[PDB]
């Protein structure tokens, strides 16, 4: 079955776009190299298309079969209920694409009559009727890179494939709940979202300690939303389905596989159509759920088909990392080659094939990695850090052009203790803050692929109750990241680090003046600046802050909303 046909009718944009990033002062006191940066439009659309249009056939066996049946009788230990209409409400963004019907996120939220009238409309012919396909809306994402000529010029545009409004609170109130439950059942510590930053490094640390001598790879499907069958989503809601769940529920579940899920008709935004999905649909509720479960299903089994030694897994929606028990160099090789092609006949060819890493901090999970740091006291500190490229290159682009959602919020709370996030996002964003005077005011932001809303000057607390109060006073840096770090600067025209540090000195001077909360942002976020440093103490607001369930509730993506 070929993952996508095509009418021909173009993927169009309901805006307009632009793909150059905006000389501007602002933007340009971060990096200069302004015609690096790109933003992906729908003027690349028809690349991706080509891309993620295949054929996929599949092969199961014993492995495949018995993984299966393990994980279905793990799901049966899963109570799960619906949502009520209102619940599903208040968990759509603010910002979510507006329903064809009249009415949009804001009236969602606030609960009007048009827009609540029109989803119970939708959940009982969901109810009525499992049997006719849902359209769906196929757009090109806006996103922001630098140029990397090295790997070939530009990104074309990711596609996104979604149902209306309407359809897509009423997948909340099927399925929410089943997204907080069922990953854990059934894979328990290998699901990554429920990690935070730090959990997900703590739990990479006791993978490679439990092994005798450690070997781990991560492996990159081709298009893995394309290589998903119509067998594996069908095979996802029998899953659902051995959850303990009340009848209506499972009605919906059923009806939102078939009508929806499995495939349909897809339109452009002038509302022609474009073309019919026989795949996983990038932009629904079940998006990163079901990719990390059929991921699993398929990697374990790939493990035992290949007869990969005490493997240690952890998956996040497409991403995937393995770490097991080395068998010896050439031994390793030819145990990946056999994994990769068990994941090949189970429908998931790789992109470029998986290479054996002897080496915890060169192992890339989510675009990100462990390392190493000193922490006060002198004690050695590992933390999550990434290359800044895109952070820094999206950075630039949201000073100058305002979007509902910001990529560096989020970024600076991720990636807090690392030294780019301290010396150059934290420098920056602050200084902009100030300079547009708008410190005290909550701002959105994706992470983990989903939304959340925070306010600036309470990044203290927040930082200290994710990264502990060392996230303010790491120093003497791996020579691997000080040198990424670096180029990284270099490569986008950015100030060198030592710039930046004179730069902070005054941000953190005049967030002192402010006094308050803003004072609390100097004083904490830049002692690192400040030749005679201050003697930091834990915040008590950071104790009185829940963030414990803050992962495990974005639901590993998507049109999810939390404060």
Same mark, same amino acid.
């Given at each position: 079955?070929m993952s996508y =046909?095509?009418?021909?009718?173009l993927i169009t944009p309901?805006s307009?776009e632009?793909?150059?990033l905006?000389?501007?002062?602002? =933007?340009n006191?971060?990096?200069?190299? *302004? ?10 659309a028809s690349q991706?298309?080509?891309k993620?249009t ?10 495949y079969?018995?993984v299966?049946k ?9 109570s799960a209920?619906?949502?009520?209409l209102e619940?599903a ?5 603010? *910002?979510?694409?507006?329903s064809?019907?009249?009415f ?6 606030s609960l ?14 969901l ?9 769906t809306?196929?757009?090109?994402k806006?996103?922001v ?9 530009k990104?074309p ?7 209306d ?12 709940d089943?997204?907080?439950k069922?990953?854990?059942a ?10 935070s ?8 640390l ?18 893995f ?21 009340p ?5 919906a ?5 078939? $009508? ?11 509302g022609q ?9 990038s ?14 299903v398929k990697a ?5 088909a ?5 493997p ?5 929606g ?6 097991s028990?080395?068998?010896?160099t050439?031994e ?9 092609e ?17 080496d915890?901090?060169?192992?890339? =999970?989510?675009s ?9 006291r ?9 290359d800044?490229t895109?952070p ?8 100058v052009? *305002?979007?509902?959602?910001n990529?560096?919020?989020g970024?600076?709370?991720q990636?807090?203790?690392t030294?780019?996030?301290?010396m150059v996002?934290m420098?920056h964003?602050?200084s902009i803050?100030?300079v ?16 959340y ?26 020579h691997?990241?000080?040198?990424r770090?670096?180029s990284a600067? $270099? ?9 930046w540090?004179? $730069?902070? $000195?005054?941000v953190?001077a005049?967030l002192? =003046?402010?006094?308050?909360?803003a ?5 904490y976020l ?10 930091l ?6 104790r009185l ?5 803050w992962?495990t509730?974005?639901?590993?993506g998507?049109?999810?909303? *939390?404060?």
């Amino acid at each position: 079955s070929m993952s996508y =046909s095509w009418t021909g009718a173009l993927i169009t944009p309901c805006s307009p776009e632009e793909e150059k990033l905006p000389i501007n002062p602002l =933007s340009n006191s971060l990096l200069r190299y *302004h015609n690096k940066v790109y933003c992906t439009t729908s003027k690349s659309a028809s690349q991706r298309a080509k891309k993620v249009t295949f054929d996929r056939t599949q092969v199961l066996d014993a492995h495949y079969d018995s993984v299966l049946k393990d994980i279905k009788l793990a799901a049966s230990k899963v109570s799960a209920r619906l949502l009520t209409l209102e619940e599903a409400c208040q968990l759509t963004p603010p *910002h979510s694409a507006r329903s064809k019907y009249g009415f949009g996120a804001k009236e969602v939220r606030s609960l009007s009559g048009r827009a609540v009238n029109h989803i119970k409309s939708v959940w009982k012919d969901l109810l009525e009727d499992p049997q006719t396909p849902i359209p769906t809306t196929i757009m090109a994402k806006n996103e922001v890179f630098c140029v990397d000529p090295a790997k070939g010029g530009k990104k074309p545009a990711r596609l996104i494939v979604y149902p209306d409004l309407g359809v897509r609170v009423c997948e909340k109130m099927a399925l929410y709940d089943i997204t907080q439950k069922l990953p854990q059942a059934v894979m328990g510590a290998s699901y990554g979202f429920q990690y935070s930053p730090a959990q997900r490094v703590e739990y990479l640390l006791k993978a490679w300690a439990e092994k005798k001598d450690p070997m781990g790879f991560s492996y990159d499907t081709r298009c893995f939303d394309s290589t998903v069958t119509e067998r594996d989503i069908r095979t996802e809601e029998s899953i659902y389905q051995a959850c303990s769940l009340p009848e209506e529920a499972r009605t919906a579940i059923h009806s939102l596989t078939e $009508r929806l899920y499995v495939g349909g008709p897809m339109f452009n935004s002038k509302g022609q159509t474009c073309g019919y999905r026989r795949c996983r649909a990038s932009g629904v509720l079940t998006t990163s759920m079901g990719n990390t479960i059929t991921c699993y299903v398929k990697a374990l089994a790939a493990c035992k088909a290949a007869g990969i030694v005490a493997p240690t897994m952890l998956v996040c929606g497409d991403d995937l990392v393995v770490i097991s028990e080395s068998q010896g160099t050439e031994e390793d090789e030819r145990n990946l080659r056999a994994f990769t092609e068990a994941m090949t006949r189970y429908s998931a060819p790789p992109g470029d094939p998986p290479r054996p890493e002897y080496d915890l901090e060169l192992i890339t =999970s989510c675009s990100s990695n462990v390392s190493v740091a000193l922490g006060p006291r002198g004690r050695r500190r590992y933390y999550l850090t990434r290359d800044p490229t895109t952070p820094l290159a999206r950075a630039a682009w949201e000073t100058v052009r *305002h979007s509902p959602i910001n990529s560096w919020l989020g970024n600076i709370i991720q990636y807090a203790p690392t030294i780019w996030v301290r010396m150059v996002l934290m420098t920056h964003f602050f200084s902009i803050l100030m300079v547009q005077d708008t410190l005290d005011q909550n701002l959105n932001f994706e992470m983990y692929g989903s939304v959340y809303s925070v306010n600036p000057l309470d990044l203290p607390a927040i930082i200290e109750r994710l990264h502990g109060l060392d996230a303010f006073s790491m120093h003497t840096y791996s020579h691997h990241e000080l040198t990424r770090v670096a180029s990284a600067l $270099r490569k986008l025209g950015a100030p060198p680090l030592r710039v930046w540090k004179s $730069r902070a $000195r005054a941000v953190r001077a005049s967030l002192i =003046s402010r006094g308050g909360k803003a004072a609390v942002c100097g004083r904490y976020l830049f002692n690192w600046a400040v030749k005679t440093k201050l003697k930091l103490t834990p915040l008590p607001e950071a104790r009185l802050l829940d963030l414990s369930s803050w992962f495990t509730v974005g639901a590993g993506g998507g049109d999810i909303f *939390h404060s």
